[PDB]
Amino acid sequence: ADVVTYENKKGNVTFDHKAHAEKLGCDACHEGTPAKIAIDKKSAHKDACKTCHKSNNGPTKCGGCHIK
Numbered sequence: 001a002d003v004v005t006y007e008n009k010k011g012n013v014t015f016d017h018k019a020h021a022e023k024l025g026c027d028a029c030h031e032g033t034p035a036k037i038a039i040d041k042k043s044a045h046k047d048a049c050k051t052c053h054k055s056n057n058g059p060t061k062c063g064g065c066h067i068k
């Protein structure tokens with residue numbers, strides 16, 4: 001899709017898949033080939049979502065992703 005969300009317990013995490021794609025390229029997330037990714041709590045918080053954004057914008061605590 002162009003937008004997805006992980007409907008997680010906290011507050012659903014929107015991700016403008018398309019946006020990230022056209023803004024960045026593809027490489028950004030899908031090096032070899034896309035076959036899903038399945039970015040969970042661990043991945044997301046560790047080194048996927050909540051690593052990239054550091055140098056781009058400052059979501060300090062939360063809210064950045066979880067719409068809650």
Ligand code: HEC
Nearest residue numbers: 001017020021024025026028029030034035036037038039
């Ligand atoms: C990181 C911010 C991403 C960018 C940039 C792109 N994609 Fe992506 N993609 C990403 C995630 C986290 C997911 C998985 C969602 C899940 O359910 O696990 C995906 C998924 C895809 C898929 C699979 C869709 C499906 O029906 O399962 C495809 C085919 C895909 N992505 C392709 C794709 C392309 C072509 C992009 C660059 C041009 C692109 N993605 C960017 C994360 C990210």
Ligand code: HEC
Nearest residue numbers: 006008009010013040041044049050059061062063064065
């Ligand atoms: C984007 C950079 C994020 C920010 C900002 C925060 N979180 Fe997050 N979180 C994110 C994703 C993509 C996911 C995936 C959902 C999953 O469970 O795999 C998560 C997940 C969590 C979870 C687990 C929720 C569940 O349903 O089990 C927790 C407990 C969580 N996140 C907490 C949390 C808090 C407290 C934040 C501020 C400190 C926060 N998240 C920010 C993406 C992002």
Ligand code: HEC
Nearest residue numbers: 013014015020024028039044048049052053056057064065
């Ligand atoms: C680094 C290449 C990125 C990865 C990997 C992820 N995101 Fe991202 N995100 C990135 C940028 C450059 C931006 C800002 C775009 C702009 O126009 O300036 C964003 C923005 C978001 C947003 C909005 C946050 C805001 O500042 O308003 C969301 C909701 C978001 N990103 C979610 C998200 C998730 C959950 C990711 C892991 C699956 C993720 N992003 C990865 C760059 C990058």
